[PDB]
């Protein structure tokens, strides 16, 4: 069956471009989805006879990729994110021992599923220091029972597997944003077998395509707590006006076919609020656009000033606040987008200090980066550490290795620099 | 004191003067001087030069803090010289 | 004609690669609504001569899109200005919110970014314009350093520029080099001539200045 294994490895091997062209598939589907018309049901193809029938497959074709992609994700980030969580929880026990001590309830939420996972043998599935549990008994075990902490801790293929880890693992799979994303996507894909028009929503995937749209959504959502006040205030105001409108001003709300015939003005408290909520919350041209006036009558000055209050407190304040609420934010996170390159090219991403001091030599601070600090070099140094045996470790790398063991990471520069320190 | 005594006729010469700092190949900054041709100076004054300089400065300060200030500068000079090589033709 | 208008075109698209999303984000919006509209809400799209005579509501997918693509993409007064309602009927609670999804999402969230994608952008290169004049009048264009240190003598940094560095002098210096024969080159100029030959251009100040260096 190993051809299928390596074929999935091809699948991951080309994971992005499939995603991209798939989205181009759905985009094309959706362009061409611009044709069906009921007679009841019927589809208006133009020229070629094969477009709708290709879709009989294309849906599924697209859907195939969905199915495809999901499995690939299982081969992709999944073991990575599992590795990530693994390192997380593990280092947490390494220094904090929260399950020994600062345990979660449904509060400190992440840990609620994570309680059970430690019990399993196979907790350290992929941390490549997969012996940590015994260090944990080594440290936190003396405070308690050395074996009480161990009480906490320490085809053929079907029966092997190991059990309790698994449900937590699929739960971590649930934790992912991307996996809900592709899952919602695929569920929609199977909806395409049910109906190709509900199948259109895949285009939403463009929201992740690419960063710019993700910029947009991020523009919206980082601060919806701010949205609360606005929609709230809007609702507020709308009550505020509407109630008096149900009081002092019912008689202006007609939208009768001009001539005196009975109509759907006001009529209910709800209905009037939703009248303004359909209209006045939009307005643009205002409530005064469709209120029945002049009028020309009693309390006219007050309805007019009413209109004015509506036109300032709403038309102007609310909407705009929302608008700035968004825009300032787009410029915010965008400014953070340029700010990356700016900080990379100014303050050193490592030693800090600032480019300024290393620009003293011409073109110099890039040399202070890639040719000195670089940054990836740290990590390449780490793999270099990991591959070497401890016997052959040079003493510097060895204490540094220990510092890896202890994770203070203090030996990364305060910001002093060698040639800066000397000359 | 001696300069002021000799300062009596130097003013005629400042137009003609060209002066600049240079950080020479010995870790000091010389304040050398040099003459500037007037016929060349005249050509500098009006066409797509002063404006080109408004342009060029915009061409640099738009990305000027990079140490190509020295380098981007190069071509402009060589270019305007070519411009005077053209200006001479008319 | 002139820069003042050239600014404007520059505004349009120095940062127009951001713009890619916008009409696409809007297409999204519109592909979105319209299909549900072609499903749950066809019956509200009439623009018949009021009285019951046959009309050009929806009628085709393209058309209902282009309708909103003509109208809804403009909106202003929104689709709810020209959708046939109340209605007053089934799925009314949703259509209104459908009108609202059409509204907060579009009327505000779409269009504004689309505006502000440009407006800062106008204010970007424009801000650089004074910033040009500011940087010439702050940091030295030549030695850098900043005006600040040369403002210590009154009115003095123009002397550090227009009379010292001048900047423009450098160029005359080259022709001064070129016109001269190599025989008569002074030895200070000559390496500098050589440095021209080699083009490191490092003999321009690190930013240390002569009278700054000493006194
Ligand atoms: Zn550094
Ligand atoms: Zn200077």
From Swiss-Prot, chain B:
Full protein stretch here: 4162 to 4251 of 5037
UniProt: ATP binding residues: 50-54
Miscellaneous comment: Binding of [3H]ryanodine indicates that the heterozygous channel is activated by Ca(2+) concentrations 4-fold lower than normal. Single-cell analysis of cotransfected cells shows a significantly increased resting cytoplasmic Ca(2+) level and a significantly reduced luminal Ca(2+) level.
Self-association and partners: Homotetramer. Can also form heterotetramers with RYR2. Identified in a complex composed of RYR1, PDE4D, PKA, FKBP1A and protein phosphatase 1 (PP1). Repeated very high-level exercise decreases interaction with PDE4D and protein phosphatase 1 (PP1). Interacts with CALM; CALM with bound calcium inhibits the RYR1 channel activity. Interacts with S100A1. Interacts with FKBP1A; this stabilizes the closed conformation of the channel. Interacts with CACNA1S; interaction with CACNA1S is important for activation of the RYR1 channel. Interacts with CACNB1.
Domain of life from the UniProt record: Eukaryota
Coiled coil: none
Protein name as annotated: Ryanodine receptor 1
Reported tissue expression: Detected in skeletal muscle (at protein level). Fast- or slow-twitch skeletal muscle.
Protein role: Cytosolic calcium-activated calcium channel that mediates the release of Ca(2+) from the sarcoplasmic reticulum into the cytosol and thereby plays a key role in triggering muscle contraction following depolarization of T-tubules. Repeated very high-level exercise increases the open probability of the channel and leads to Ca(2+) leaking into the cytoplasm. Can also mediate the release of Ca(2+) from intracellular stores in neurons, and may thereby promote prolonged Ca(2+) signaling in the brain. Required for normal embryonic development of muscle fibers and skeletal muscle.
UniProt note: domains: The calcium release channel activity resides in the C-terminal region while the remaining part of the protein constitutes the 'foot' structure spanning the junctional gap between the sarcoplasmic reticulum (SR) and the T-tubule. Pore opening is mediated via the cytoplasmic calcium-binding domains that mediate a small rotation of the channel-forming transmembrane regions that then leads to channel opening.
Gene name linked to the record: RYR1
Family of this protein: Belongs to the ryanodine receptor (TC 1.A.3.1) family. RYR1 subfamily.
Modification after translation, per record: The N-terminus is blocked.
Subcellular location: Sarcoplasmic reticulum membrane
């Amino acid at each position: 069956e190993v051809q299928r294994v390596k074929f999935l490895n091809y699948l991951s091997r080309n994971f992005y471009t499939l995603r991209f062209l798939a989205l181009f598939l759905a985009f094309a589907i959706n362009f061409i989805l611009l044709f069906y018309k009921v007679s009841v049901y019927y589809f208006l193809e133009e020229s070629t006879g094969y477009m709708e029938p290709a879709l009989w497959c294309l849906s599924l074709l697209h859907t195939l990729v969905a199915f495809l992609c999901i499995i690939g994700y299982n081969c992709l980030k999944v073991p990575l994110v599992i590795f990530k969580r693994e390192k997380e929880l593990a280092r947490k026990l390494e220094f904090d021992g929260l399950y020994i001590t600062e345990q979660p309830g449904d509060d400190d939420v992440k840990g609620q599923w994570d309680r059970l996972v430690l019990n399993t043998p196979s907790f350290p599935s992929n941390y490549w220091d997969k012996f940590v549990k015994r260090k944990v008994l080594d440290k936190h075990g003396d405070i308690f029972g050395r074996e009480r902490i161990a009480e906490l801790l320490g085809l053929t293929w079907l029966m092997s597997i190991d059990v309790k880890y698994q449900i937590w693992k699929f739960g971590v799979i649930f934790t992912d944003n991307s996996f809900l994303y592709l899952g919602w996507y695929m569920v929609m894909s199977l909806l395409g077998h049910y109906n190709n028009f509900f199948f259109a929503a895949h285009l939403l995937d463009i929201a992740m395509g690419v960063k710019t749209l993700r910029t947009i959504l991020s523009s919206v959502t980082h601060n919806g707590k701010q949205l609360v006040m606005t929609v709230g205030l809007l609702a507020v105001v709308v009550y505020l006006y509407t109630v008096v409108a149900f009081n002092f001003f019912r008689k202006f709300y007609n939208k009768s076919e001009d001539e005196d015939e009975p109509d759907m003005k006001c009529d209910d408290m709800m209905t009037c609020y939703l009248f303004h909520m359909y209209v006045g919350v939009r307005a643009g041209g205002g409530i005064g656009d469709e209120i029945e006036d002049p009028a020309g009558d009693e309390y006219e000055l007050y309805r007019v000033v009413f209109d004015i209050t509506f036109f300032f407190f709403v038309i102007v304040i609310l909407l705009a606040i929302i608008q700035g609420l968004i825009i300032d934010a787009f410029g915010e996170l965008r400014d953070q987008q340029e700010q990356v390159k700016e900080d990379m090219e100014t303050k050193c991403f490592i030693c800090g200090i600032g480019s300024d001091y290393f620009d003293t030599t011409p073109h110099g601070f890039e040399t202070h980066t890639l040719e000195e600090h670089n940054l990836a070099n740290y990590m390449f140094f780490l793999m270099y550490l990991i591959n070497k045996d401890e016997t052959e470790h040079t003493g510097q790398e060895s204490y540094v290795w220990k510092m890896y063991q202890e994770r203070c990471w203090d030996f990364f520069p305060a910001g002093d620099c060698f040639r800066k320190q000397y000359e | 004191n001696f300069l002021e005594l000799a300062e009596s006729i130097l003013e005629y010469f400042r137009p003609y003067l060209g002066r600049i700092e240079i950080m020479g190949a010995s870790r000091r900054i010389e304040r050398i001087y040099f003459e500037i041709s007037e016929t060349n100076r005249a050509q500098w004054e009006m066409p797509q030069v002063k404006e080109s300089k408004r342009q060029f400065i915009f061409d640099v300060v738009n990305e000027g803090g990079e140490a190509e200030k020295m380098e981007l500068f190069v071509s402009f000079c060589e270019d305007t010289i070519f411009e005077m090589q053209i200006a001479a033709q008319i």
